[PDB]
Amino acid sequence: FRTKPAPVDPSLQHEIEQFYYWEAKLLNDRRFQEWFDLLAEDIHYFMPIRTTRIMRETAQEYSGAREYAHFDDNAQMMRGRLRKITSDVSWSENPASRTRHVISNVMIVDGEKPGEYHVSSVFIVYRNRLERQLDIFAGERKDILRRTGSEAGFELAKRTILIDQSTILSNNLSFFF
Amino acid sequence: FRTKPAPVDPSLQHEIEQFYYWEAKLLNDRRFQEWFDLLAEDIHYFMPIRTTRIMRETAQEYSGAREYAHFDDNAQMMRGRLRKITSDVSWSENPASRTRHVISNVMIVDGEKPGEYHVSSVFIVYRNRLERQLDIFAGERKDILRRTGSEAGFELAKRTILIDQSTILSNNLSFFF
Amino acid sequence: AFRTKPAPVDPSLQHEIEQFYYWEAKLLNDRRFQEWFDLLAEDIHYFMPIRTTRIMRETAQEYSGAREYAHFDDNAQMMRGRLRKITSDVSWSENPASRTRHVISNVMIVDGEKPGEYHVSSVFIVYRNRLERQLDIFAGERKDILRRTGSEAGFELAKRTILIDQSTILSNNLSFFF
Amino acid sequence: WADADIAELVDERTGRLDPRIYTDEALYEQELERIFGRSWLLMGHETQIPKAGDFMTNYMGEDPVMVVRQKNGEIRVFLNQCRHRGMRICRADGGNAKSFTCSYHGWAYDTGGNLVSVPFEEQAFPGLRKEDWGPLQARVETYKGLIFANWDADAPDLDTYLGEAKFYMDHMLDRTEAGTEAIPGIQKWVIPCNWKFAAEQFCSDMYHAGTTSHLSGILAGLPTEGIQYRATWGGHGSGFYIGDPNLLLAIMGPKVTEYWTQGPAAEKASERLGSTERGQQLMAQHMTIFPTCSFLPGINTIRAWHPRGPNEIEVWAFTVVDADAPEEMKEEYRQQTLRTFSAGGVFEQDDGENWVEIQQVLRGHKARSRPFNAEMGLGQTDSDNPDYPGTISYVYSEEAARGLYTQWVRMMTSPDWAALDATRP
Amino acid sequence: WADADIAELVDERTGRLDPRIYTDEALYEQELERIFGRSWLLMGHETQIPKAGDFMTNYMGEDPVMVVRQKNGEIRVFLNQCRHRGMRICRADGGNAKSFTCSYHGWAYDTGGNLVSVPFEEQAFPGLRKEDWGPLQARVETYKGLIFANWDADAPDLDTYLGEAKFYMDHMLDRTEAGTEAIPGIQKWVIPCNWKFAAEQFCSDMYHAGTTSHLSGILAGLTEGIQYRATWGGHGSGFYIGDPNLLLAIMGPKVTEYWTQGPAAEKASERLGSTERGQQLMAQHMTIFPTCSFLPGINTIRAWHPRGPNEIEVWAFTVVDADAPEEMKEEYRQQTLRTFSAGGVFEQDDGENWVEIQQVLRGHKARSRPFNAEMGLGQTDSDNPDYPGTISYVYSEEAARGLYTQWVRMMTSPDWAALDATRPA
Amino acid sequence: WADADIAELVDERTGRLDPRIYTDEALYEQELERIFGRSWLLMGHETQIPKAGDFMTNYMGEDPVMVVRQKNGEIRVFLNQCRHRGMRICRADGGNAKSFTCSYHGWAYDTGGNLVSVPFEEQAFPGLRKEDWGPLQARVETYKGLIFANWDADAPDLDTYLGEAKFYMDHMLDRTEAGTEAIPGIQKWVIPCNWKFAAEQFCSDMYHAGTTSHLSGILAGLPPTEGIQYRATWGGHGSGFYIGDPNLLLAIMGPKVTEYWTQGPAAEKASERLGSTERGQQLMAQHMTIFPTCSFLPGINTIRAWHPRGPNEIEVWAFTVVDADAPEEMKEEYRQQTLRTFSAGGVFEQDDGENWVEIQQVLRGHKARSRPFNAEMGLGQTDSDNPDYPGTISYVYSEEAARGLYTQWVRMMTSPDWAALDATR
Ligand SMILES: c1ccc(-c2ccccc2)cc1
Ligand SMILES: c1ccc(-c2ccccc2)cc1
Ligand SMILES: c1ccc(-c2ccccc2)cc1
Ligand code: FES
Ligand code: FES
Ligand code: FES
Ligand SMILES: [Fe+2]
Ligand SMILES: [Fe+2]
Ligand SMILES: [Fe+2]
């Protein structure tokens, strides 16, 4: 994405858009088993810590590879999170949050391997819970989708959530971007 | 939408999206006479009350058919609401609020009768009034759209607005989702 | 213009203008301001009228007019000055820089009278977060005139009108772009 | 705030109201202690929680509470706080509970709010008496389906607290031997205004309906004689039009209007109430049970107002119907009631808009510096009315409102129920 | 807060400002009484409301006010609050009306703010004297286009209040016999900072312009001067002399030329009896205490509106000479908008600065030591033959110290009599 | 609030806490003065700012500070407030700088926060002693990598303030001669609850871990009974831990970290430096608080400072420390497991965030604040002369440590200076 993506067949745009719209419905409707099934064996689910920097130093704005982060999980760690979030004793999500993943700005670029795709999209995540809690997030998800023989049509191989926050404006991050 | 929707032709996607994008303009620009003209005479405009439930009772998360609701209107009731909102003595909308319906995640499934279409989409509704009032909403709208000979192309036969709020975070609900 | 429902257009035209806006948002959000200002036409008119609370019978005076004060009302020369400022290591409103997110939807396209040109309505949420905890959420409509162009973006922005869903601006400044 | 200072803020003999009763934080602290901490407060309807285990959350001021049906058919209301370290015992709005378990350190409660178990009791809490470490219990009584609760043992019982106001409540609650039931579903929303505006309006303010507020709401559905009750004591009030079905038809439609004034069910209500006027000629009644229970007999919306500081309230509303009404009438009450008196309703939409502007203006120093005009219908009373008990005025009066604010003074200036009881005639 | 404790918060002798003046809630409330409740405040410009019936809202403190042209040409200002139950009389920002009707219970007002009728008055309000029950009225006076209001009957007239600051206002308001007009449109935005930082900056603070704050806004545009500090009242103004350079970077070549050369700049010198005044003053800033501020030359003007101690709104507009060519009215319009606005390339950065000052003052240590206000101490001259008042070099905080001393005097005076007695003979 | 009134709020004799300690605004203002203004508080770790010029921001209460490495290796801490007119001297979270300039009026500082220049000093500021006008400086002192700060010159040194809590800190900080380092990256988030809930949890609350709070978090790491707790003889610090059973540690941090902590050369070396095989190899899931707001979990290796934001809110600033000589695979494993568990999004700390937030909202209620919480667990079951572990030792399930924390709260809150605080020893 360092230069404008080359045009793509609108049939491809529509397909990957549909994949994300369906992803959003699974998350938002608490169908977590199905959402985790979208994840690849080699999933890297990554959400780096963002910091405020003077212009001459915006290179260190995000935490890098061997540094602390909000998320930086592999398939095993994501499998633990799924156990937790479908638990009758998981208090952050029982009672369950009400989330909305508004997905836009989908841009697609061919991958290095075929059947793989680099995707950039933006989001508003709206989390309402209990009586009156309202946390509104926004950002970019830089993905790598890989083609698969399933109904979903793809699996998520890599996700980097660039969050538009320094300090997280939420008492937790108990849901998934 | 119990399972992932069978792919549709991108021209149908585009036709329905443009119908919602034009719908949004009608509402945000206060063209209420034209908006109500979209409602079929069998219109069911429903918005159930949402509650916070433990995981084992999420079946009762939404109010059902013979229960109380934010909206549960037929053509006669909506006509009354049009007659109210186009009057110089309707104080909640004179002065008028400024709204924005940011629609996305449009997924389309073919209806039972031909010419009909099950649609799921998400929204943010941003509503600002007077000097500094700001109410931000999100949710899903599950519609049945029906083919028609008008310039619009469809009529809204049914709509269920699932709002991501328990307690409503607004002094009223004087606009339309 | 968008007085009646836009005539259907080729899905390839929808996709291509959409991708322009998606890329535009990436430039702004990732602070690639040199490239963003390059998208601007030499006859750019960048307009954000002051909006105002009125009774029904006076909604005509909701928006400020052509010879009236405004949030933005800028030509190429004026926007050139804002590009100089925002690329200064002493531009304190954006050093340290804001973190913005333009979420674009409701893109509706109508053929322009002049070939190559297009009138587009689209909506937005601009999410702007900064410093430790500052958060401003904006929404509104963008009425643009786009012009087809041989640059990699593929259009330039000839005209933009930002219709903001606020009367009093709920933000200490407007140091970024819509 | 000294007691003497508080009593000046409201004068019922001249009819002035100092607007700082709506804005001052110290007054509001004192309201929670002296009004909400010892008033009877609407919790719901019995039919909302019919089976044992069935619970619903509610509020008493800003204290969150559980309302739960017991094994034996009693209802307990207790504070939704664990006494260990203050965790909310239940985070769900309602359901059917087998028990409750505190999510922080596992203190377990039964459905009556009793502490029945504590992890590691024998090693870590040897002395502990679990029967003394349950959340505060409130007194719970009922009147014709409505559940009220009150923390204070020194308070009078519901029936006395309601007093002569029973008469006017009965126009909605006592229309049939079957009693009423709640339509399931409770709407909640946030209006940034003081609670005394809402309570007052439903106590005394037919004038707002009879003029400009609801012009547009009446038009969406397409008024001369009437009286206003003002409690001899206690701050309750009700008003209603007599004779003319006009206004009810434009609010609730022709089916409900007919049901309210004509045919078997309406004649039944005239009989049990001993008066053709009460049962069949009453139109668009509003009422408040001091402080924060309000309802509109006929339309049949009822709600509690919950304070959220001086500058905000929550409204928790639902609809009651005659238990024996035909299924098609219950359905009509459901639709018409949500069409009108809810957040999106064509009437109530507009109340939320008005009250919000009043409160925002009172940020201003000068706006809090002169009194409001509470003088409507001063002197034009009659406490000797043969058919209607209490202090009766014309339906356009603020006499009930004067009594609501006088009661507010009496509660706010009484250290306990003994002192308050000493303010009656 | 006793008067003696307030006086110790500011020291004009040493040059110290206790930071708690910008944060303490109790001070803020006293500022609303003692500053905003009796000061002259900017309502706007005659030409924003030219015809009978034209109105615009504004604020005096957090009191919302209507500002209305009458049939006899008079400008009235009244509280936008209905005395019945506090409803905002008019919720529009401005328009033209023949009357104003309250939407709550329909109390009707003529365009001067008089209560002219009340629904059902005869059967429900027999005693009522309507002429006693209208919204509070402010005194309105103008100065060469500018509208000011003031609640207090014992305050000096506007002319006295402005005093010798009129001399400095005339560099913007009296450059021609035609007068100024307001370009239509008022930008309002919210800045989470104390009003005093903004009032002070336009009063005293050329230092920030000639240092680091606006380096970037000057780049977007590619020494000597004096400062005035009123002898009494806390007004201030500073300006550079004889150096076009800077004013060309802010406003560009066409505005700079109109301000310094040609017939219109000759007329200005004639009318101000001095070439220095008319053609040589470059980038003037000024505050009429407490919250009216402007920059002659650039011709932005604004009112700062308090919103507690931690927030303000800025309501800004631009004025042009009414006989200026239409190309010059247009240039002024675009350049002010490009510079001294929420999005403008200068004012952008003032917003960010004030915001961070105020957040930092949440800290306990941050509020525990005085700020330094000793710049230019004792480097004054109050017998200057060309410029009235207490003159300093353009980089000084005399005016600042004068503004905080007028703050002290108003905060420690029970009334205008006590305040008149702090004047010098 | 009077000294005696504050002492009744806490009762370690019968084990009772008044919930107003968590809500009252006046006690909060006093906390900032009497606790945060004179306690030692975590600024971070030495290796986060290893090179000269390296800075990071932090807070001491609601006072923002700069932590900056000097050319001589000194670490300086100074208020992030320019003394001129309050601007925040630096708005980035960290980086490397040769100096800092105020963006408002350009007052310049060296990397130690000494004022080194003032624009136009000669004319504008003739008298100015620049070395008296630099921002307030805190005392800085380290302990085994950790940086701490304290405004008060009269406070004891960091060694003494820690006292015998050094022993329990050492289970994390002194396991090898190379010392620890920080993994780069600090997570910051906002939890609407009082700081004392968090400080207390890490001080004394293994009970919540061994019951319900984290049933789900233990589950997530899948395919305990002996332990003691330390209360400080004085000063409010506490730590608890399990002995013997590596089951719980396994399900939190996984097998690699469990192995590193309990078997092999690195654990064997820890046992050697601490003079006990128990201390080095048999300690499971230690929690610790250095009063008031420094908390960490030796073994898990997460450390954090809680920052107050009024009584109803905190920020948590969290980061991970590793042994500096540990294999790069173990540094990596500590990184993943720690952000998986003890972070905003982690499978453990997720649930603490939800519990705390609900505790605080419930305390908006009046009855909710009118009865004491139960702090009676483990009363009397102590031992102040344990041969192996210094301090007052209890079973691992106990609120003895918590009582000590709140008793130290009482002491600091009721002592005008450190002399009177030393008088309670
Ligand atoms: C309080 C609340 C509502 C009404 C009311 C509104 C419209 C029609 C009839 C009664 C009167 C007092
Ligand atoms: C107060 C406010 C603004 C200015 C000013 C800023 C930049 C350029 C010219 C003047 C001077 C004092
Ligand atoms: C304070 C903080 C965390 C824990 C803790 C939580 C889970 C597992 C082990 C210890 C105990 C006290
Ligand atoms: S807070 Fe309920 S058991 Fe501890
Ligand atoms: S508040 Fe204006 S008429 Fe009642
Ligand atoms: S605040 Fe004036 S120089 Fe720093
Ligand atoms: Fe009403
Ligand atoms: Fe400035
Ligand atoms: Fe925990």
Q: Is E213 marked as binding a ligand?
A: yes
Distance CA F71, CA F52 (A): 5
Q: Are C153 and E333 in contact (CB under 8 A)?
A: no
Distance CA E29, CA D25 (A): 14
**Domain limits at A46?**
1-177
Q: Is E346 in the pocket of ligand 2 (CB under 6 A)?
A: yes
Which of B2, F346, B7, B164 has the alpha carbon at shortest distance from A26? B2
Strands A154-163 and A39-48: parallel
Reading the block at residue E319, the tokens are: 């004025």
Which of E225, E261, E228, E265 has the alpha carbon at shortest distance from E241? E225
Report cis status (omega within 30 of 0) of the bond before B95: yes
Could you tell me which chains touch chain D, where touching means 3 or more CB pairs under 8 A? A, B, E, F
Q: Are B121 and B138 in contact (CB under 8 A)?
A: no
Query: Nearest-CA residue of chain F relative to C89?
Result: F103
Tell me whether C22 touches chain A (CB under 8 Å).
Answer: yes
Strands D226-230 and D391-394: antiparallel
∠ CA E178-E183-E187, rounded to 5°: 145
- Computed over its alpha carbons, how large is the radius of gyration of chain D? 22
Tell me whether F91 touches chain C (CB under 8 Å).
Answer: yes
DSSP 8-state class, residue D32? I
Strands C40-49 and C155-164: parallel
Residue C167 with chain B: CB contacts under 8 Å: 98, 128, 130-131
Which of D199, D142, D201 has the alpha carbon at shortest distance from D173? D142
For residue F321, give the H/E element and its range: strand F314-323
Where do the DSSP E strands lie in B3-67? 39-48
For chain C, how many structural domains are there in total?
A: 1
∠ CA A151-A156-A159, rounded to 5°: 155
CB atoms within 10 A of CB D258: 16
Output phi, psi for B108, to 5 deg. Answer: -120, 130
Q: Which atom of ligand 4 is nearest to the CA of F359?
A: 1
Q: Sort C164 into a burial class: Cβ within 10 Å, 0-12 / 13-18 / 19+.
A: buried
Q: Are C131 and C98 in contact (CB under 8 A)?
A: no
Question: DSSP labels for F347-401?
Answer: TTHHHHHHHHHHHHHHTTSTGGGSS-EE--TTTT-EES--SSS-SEEEESB-SHH
Name the closest-CA residue to atom 8, ligand 1.
D209
Residue E9, CA atoms < 13 Å, CB-side half-sphere = 23
SS3 A116: strand
SS3 C114: coil
Residue F32, CA atoms < 13 Å, CB-side half-sphere = 24
Q: Which atom of ligand 4 is nearest to the CA of D85?
A: 1
Cross-chain Cβ contact B122/A98 below 8 Å: no
How close are the terminal C-alpha atoms of chain B, in Å?
21
CA E364 / ligand 8 centre spacing (Å): 28
Q: How far, in Å, are C96, F43, F85, F119, F138 from residue F99 at the CA level?
A: 16, 20, 19, 15, 19
Q: Are E259 and E246 in contact (CB under 8 A)?
A: no
Q: How far, in Å, are E147, E296, E362 from residue E181 at the CA level?
A: 12, 14, 42
| Ligand in closest contact with the CA of C93 | 8
CA F198 / ligand 9 centre spacing (Å): 9
Distance CA A75, CA A95 (A): 26
Q: Is E404 marked as binding a ligand?
A: no
Distance CA A85, CA F346 (A): 12
Residue D102 with chain F: CB contacts under 8 Å: 212
Q: Is F193 marked as binding a ligand?
A: no
How close are the terminal C-alpha atoms of chain C, in Å?
21
Distance CA D81, CA F16 (A): 16
Q: Which of D190, D212, D334 sits opposite B167 (nearest CB)?
A: D190
Give me the sheet containing E75-79, strands edge to edge. Answer: E41-45, E146-150, E137-143, E75-79, E63-69, E54-60, E94-96
CA distance F381 to chain E (A): 40
DSSP 8-state class, residue E346? T
Q: Sort F115 into a burial class: Cβ within 10 Å, 0-12 / 13-18 / 19+.
A: buried
Q: Is D303 in the pocket of ligand 1 (CB under 6 A)?
A: no
Q: Are E396 and F124 in contact (CB under 8 A)?
A: yes
Query: Could you identify the residue written with the tokens 């302990």?
Result: F143
Q: Are F113 and F78 in contact (CB under 8 A)?
A: yes
Give the torsion through C-alpha atoms of E319, E323, E326, E328, to 10 deg. Answer: -60
For residue E408, give the H/E element and its range: helix E398-411
β-strand partners of C147: C117, C156
Amino acid code (one letter) for E188? K
CB atoms within 10 A of CB A55: 17
Q: Sort A145 into a burial class: Cβ within 10 Å, 0-12 / 13-18 / 19+.
A: buried
Reading the block at residue C129, the tokens are: 């977060």
Q: Is E369 in the pocket of ligand 5 (CB under 6 A)?
A: no
Residue F247, CA atoms < 13 Å, CB-side half-sphere = 7
**Helix-strand-coil split of chain C, %, nearest 5:** 25, 40, 35
Site to substitute for ligand 4 among D91, D102, D116, D121, most atoms within 8 A of C-beta:
D102
Q: Is E47 marked as binding a ligand?
A: no
DSSP 8-state class, residue F118? -
Q: Is D85 in the pocket of ligand 4 (CB under 6 A)?
A: yes
Can you give the resolution of this entry in Å? 2.6
CA distance E188 to chain C (A): 5
Q: Are B152 and C5 in contact (CB under 8 A)?
A: yes
Distance CA F190, CA F298 (A): 24
Where do the DSSP E strands lie in chain B? 39-48, 69-73, 98-110, 116-129, 133-147, 154-163
Which of F269, F306, F241 has the alpha carbon at shortest distance from F36? F306
β-strand partners of E69: E75
Which of F255, F328, F300 has the alpha carbon at shortest distance from A65? F328
Question: Chain-centre distance of CA D72, in angstroms?
Answer: 27
CA E314 / ligand 8 centre spacing (Å): 14
What's the CATH number where B77 sits?
A: 3.10.450.50
Amino acid code (one letter) for E345? V
CB atoms within 10 A of CB D177: 9
Question: Chain-centre distance of CA C22, in angstroms?
Answer: 12
Q: Are E184 and C64 in contact (CB under 8 A)?
A: yes
Distance CA A80, CA A78 (A): 5
β-strand partners of A47: A71
β-strand partners of A56: none
Q: Are D227 and D388 in contact (CB under 8 A)?
A: yes
Q: How far, in Å, are B109, D161, E246 from residue D56 at the CA level?
A: 38, 24, 69
Cross-chain Cβ contact D62/F355 below 8 Å: no
For each of the domains in chain E, give its residue range(s) and CATH number, in order of start: 1-36+164-425 (3.90.380.10), 37-163 (2.102.10.10)
Tell me whether B95 touches chain E (CB under 8 Å).
Answer: yes
Reading the block at residue E405, the tokens are: 């001393």
Q: Are F299 and F242 in contact (CB under 8 A)?
A: no
Interface of A with C in 114-153 (CB under 8 A): 120, 122-124, 136, 138-140
CB atoms within 10 A of CB E282: 23
| Ligand in closest contact with the CA of D358 | 5
Distance CA D206, CA F117 (A): 71
∠ CA D276-D278-D280, rounded to 5°: 60
Give every CB contact of residue E6 below 8 A, 6+ residues apart in sequence: E27, E408, E411, E412
Reading the block at residue D23, the tokens are: 């804005």
- Computed over its alpha carbons, how large is the radius of gyration of chain C? 17
Cross-chain Cβ contact E190/B132 below 8 Å: yes
Reading the block at residue B42, the tokens are: 């069998």
Q: Is D412 in the pocket of ligand 1 (CB under 6 A)?
A: no
Q: Is E203 marked as binding a ligand?
A: yes
CB atoms within 10 A of CB E349: 28
Query: Could you identify the residue written with the tokens 């109790």?
Result: E26
Output phi, psi for F190, to 5 deg. Answer: -110, 120
Q: Is E350 marked as binding a ligand?
A: yes
**Helix-strand-coil split of chain B, %, nearest 5:** 25, 40, 35
Which of A134, D308, D348 has the alpha carbon at shortest distance from B172? D348
| H helical segments located in D175-298 | 195-204, 206-209, 215-219, 246-261, 264-272, 276-280
Distance CA C61, CA E369 (A): 50
CB atoms within 10 A of CB E139: 16
Which of D141, D180, D175, D178 has the alpha carbon at shortest distance from D161? D141
Which of A140, A118, A1 has the alpha carbon at shortest distance from A62? A140
Report residues near ion ligand 9: CB below 5 Å. Answer: F 352
Cross-chain Cβ contact B105/A25 below 8 Å: yes
Q: Which of C15, C104, C131 sits opposite A10 (nearest CB)?
A: C15
Query: Could you identify the residue written with the tokens 């996709």?
Result: C15
Cross-chain Cβ contact C171/E216 below 8 Å: no
For residue C21, give the H/E element and its range: helix C11-29
Q: Are C56 and E172 in contact (CB under 8 A)?
A: no
Strands C117-130 and E99-101: unpaired
Cross-chain Cβ contact A95/D92 below 8 Å: yes
Q: Is D204 in the pocket of ligand 1 (CB under 6 A)?
A: no
